[PDB]
Design a protein around this ligand. Structure first.
Ligand SMILES: *[C@@H]1O[C@H](CO)[C@@H](O[C@@H]2O[C@H](CO)[C@@H](O[C@H]3O[C@H](CO)[C@@H](O)[C@H](O)[C@@H]3O)[C@H](O)[C@H]2NC(C)=O)[C@H](O)[C@H]1NC(C)=O
Ligand SMILES: CNC(=O)[C@H](Cc1c[nH]c2ccccc12)NC(=O)[C@@H](CC(=O)NO)CC(C)C
Ligand SMILES: [Ca+2]
Ligand SMILES: [Ca+2]
Ligand SMILES: [Ca+2]
Ligand SMILES: [Zn+2]
Length: 415
C-alpha cells in the first residue's frame, strides 16, 4: 500500500459556534466538506485524510484561545496531548477558531506528524468559502508533514501553490514539486509510524462518499473516480464488486479473491506478538493481537510489552553498536541526581530524579568495550530529544520487576 493515512480530529472553538448562531449541524456539514477537499488535495502526495473525530466546544473552550498564534498553538498541543489523545486514537488534530489570529490565519509545527503534542495546527475561520479554509488546513497539515514554504524555483503550474507563505485570493488545490519531495523526504528519514494504518470504515464520522478512495460503510470497495480507478475488482461509480471478484480490498484479498485460510497477513514482531492469519472466507486481516504484557520473554531476560520484549541489552546495542552492554549497577546511581541527563521522568517540564529503587528505570547506562577505548558508564543524551537514551517502558529492571512510568515495580502488579 503506497498510500499513507491521516486520521484527523478537528476541534471548533466557541467563537465559531457563536459566529454560526449555534447551528451545530451547519458547523458539522461544513467540516465534512472541508476535510473532503483536503483529502482530494492530498491525492497527489499519496496521502489520504479521513475525519475520525469532531469536537465542538459549544459550552466553553477547553483552552484560552488568544489572538496570539504561538500561545494558542502551544496550549492546543498540550491539551491534545494530555486530554484528546488520552481518550481518542488519532494521528493529527487541528483547531478552528473564529478569533482573528494576529499576524497569521493559520499556524502549525513542522515535521511533527504523530507527535503527541506537536502533531497539530490552528486554523482561523478566515472565509466562508470552503475551498479557502480547505487550503489553510492542507497548508497547516503540510507543515505537520514536514513541508516548508515554497521559494524560488518551486512550481505547481501557472497556479497559486498551497505552501506559499501567503494565501492567494485565487487559491488552487495544488502542492508544488518542492512540497511533494520534502514531504516524502520527511516520511522516509523520520518515521510517521501512525499514518501507516488504514482507518476502518466505522472509524470515519463524515458521511460516506463513493469515490473518495476511502472504504466507508455501505461500500464493498472504493477506487476513486471511474477515471483513476485501477482496481480490477471494483466498479468505481457504485463502489460495488464486479466480475469474478470475491473482494477488492484488504491484506487477505489477492487478485480479487480471499487468500487461502491460514495465510499469514501480519508478521510477528517477537515471541510477544503472535502473527495473524486469513480465514479463507474474509478479505480483511484480523486486528493485531499481542500477548499479555508481563509474560516472560527472551529466555527470562525480559517481559512482554505491547508485542515486544524490550531488554536493556538490545537497547544498549541500538544506542551504541557492538561490544556494549548493561553497565554495572553503580552506574545507574547517576540517575539520582536529577541533573541534565540523570533522572527518571518529567512532570511539568521538571526532571524528577530516580528514587534509589527506580534507578534502573531512568537514563540507560552501558559499559563500553568496543575497540579503541573503555567507558564503564556510557549514556546517551541529546537535547534534540531527551527521551532518547532513557530505559524503555516495560524493560526488566530486576528479577521479577519491570519499568512502568519510570518506576521499577513488580511484574505481577505492573499490568
Ligand atoms: C520544480 O520544477 C522546476 C521546473 O518547473 C524545477 O527547475 C527550475 O525550472 C526552470 C524552468 O521551469 C529552470 O529554467 C529556468 O532557468 C534557466 C537557467 O537560468 C533558464 O535557462 C530557463 O530559460 C528558465 O528561465 C530553472 O533553472 C530550474 N531551477 C532549478 C532549481 O534548477 C525545480 O528545480 C523543481 N523543484 C525541485 C527541486 O524539484
Ligand atoms: C492573509 N494572511 C496571510 O496570508 C499571511 C501572510 C504572512 C504572514 N506572515 C508572513 C511571512 C512571510 C510571508 C507572508 C506572511 N500568512 C498566513 O496566514 C500563513 C501562515 C503560515 O505560515 N501558516 O502555517 C498561512 C496561509 C498561507 C494560509
Ligand atoms: Ca493512524
Ligand atoms: Ca468512500
Ligand atoms: Ca499480532
Ligand atoms: Zn505556513
Amino acid at each position: 500500500n503506497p498510500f499513507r493515512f491521516v486520521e484527523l480530529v478537528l476541534v471548533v472553538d466557541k467563537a465559531m459556534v457563536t459566529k454560526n448562531n449555534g447551528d451545530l449541524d451547519k458547523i458539522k456539514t461544513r467540516m465534512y466538506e472541508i476535510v473532503n477537499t483536503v483529502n482530494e488535495i492530498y491525492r497527489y502526495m499519496y496521502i489520504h485524510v479521513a475525519l475520525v473525530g469532531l469536537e465542538i466546544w459549544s459550552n466553553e473552550d477547553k483552552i484560552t484561545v488568544k489572538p496570539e498564534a504561538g500561545y494558542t498553538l502551544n496550549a492546543f498541543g498540550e491539551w491534545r496531548k494530555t486530554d484528546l489523545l488520552t481518550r481518542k486514537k488519532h494521528d493529527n488534530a487541528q483547531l478552528l477558531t473564529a478569533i482573528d489570529l494576529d499576524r497569521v490565519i493559520g499556524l502549525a509545527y513542522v515535521g511533527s506528524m504523530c507527535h503527541p503534542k506537536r502533531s497539530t495546527g490552528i486554523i482561523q475561520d478566515y472565509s466562508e468559502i470552503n475551498l479557502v479554509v480547505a487550503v489553510i488546513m492542507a497548508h497547516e497539515m503540510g507543515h505537520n508533514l514536514g513541508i516548508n514554504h515554497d521559494s524560488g524555483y518551486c512550481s505547481c503550474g501557472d497556479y497559486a501553490c498551497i505552501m506559499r507563505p501567503e494565501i492567494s485570493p485565487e487559491p488552487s488545490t495544488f502542492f508544488s514539486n518542492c512540497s511533494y519531495f520534502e514531504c516524502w523526504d520527511f516520511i522516509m528519514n523520520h518515521n510517521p509510524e501512525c499514518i501507516l494504518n488504514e482507518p476502518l470504515g466505522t472509524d470515519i464520522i463524515s458521511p460516506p462518499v463513493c469515490g473518495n478512495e476511502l472504504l466507508e460503510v455501505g461500500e464493498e470497495c472504493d477506487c476513486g473516480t471511474p477515471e483513476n480507478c485501477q482496481n480490477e475488482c471494483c466498479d468505481a461509480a457504485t463502489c460495488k464488486l464486479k466480475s469474478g471478484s470475491q473482494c477488492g480490498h484488504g491484506d487477505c484479498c489477492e487478485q480479487c479473491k480471499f487468500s487461502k485460510s491460514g495465510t499469514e497477513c501480519r508478521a510477528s514482531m517477537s515471541e510477544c506478538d503472535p502473527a495473524e492469519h486469513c480465514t479463507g472466507q474474509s478479505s480483511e486481516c484480523p486486528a493485531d493481537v499481542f500477548h499479555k504484557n508481563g509474560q516472560p520473554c527472551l529466555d527470562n531476560y525480559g517481559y512482554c510489552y505491547n508485542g515486544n520484549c524490550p531488554i536493556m541489552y538490545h537497547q544498549c546495542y541500538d544506542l551504541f553498536g557492538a561490544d556494549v552492554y548493561e553497565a554495572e549497577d553503580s552506574c545507574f546511581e547517576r540517575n539520582q541526581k536529577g541533573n541534565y541527563y540523570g533522572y527518571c521522568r518529567k512532570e511539568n517540564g521538571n526532571k524528577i530524579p530516580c528514587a534509589p529503587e527506580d534507578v534502573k528505570c531512568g537514563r540507560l547506562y552501558c559499559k563500553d568495550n568496543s575497540p579503541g577505548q573503555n567507558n564503564p558508564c556510557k549514556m546517551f543524551y541529546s537535547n534534540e530529544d531527551e527521551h532518547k537514551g532513557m530505559v524503555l517502558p516495560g524493560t526488566k529492571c530486576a528479577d521479577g520487576k519491570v519499568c512502568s512510568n519510570g518506576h521499577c515495580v513488580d511484574v505481577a502488579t505492573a499490568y
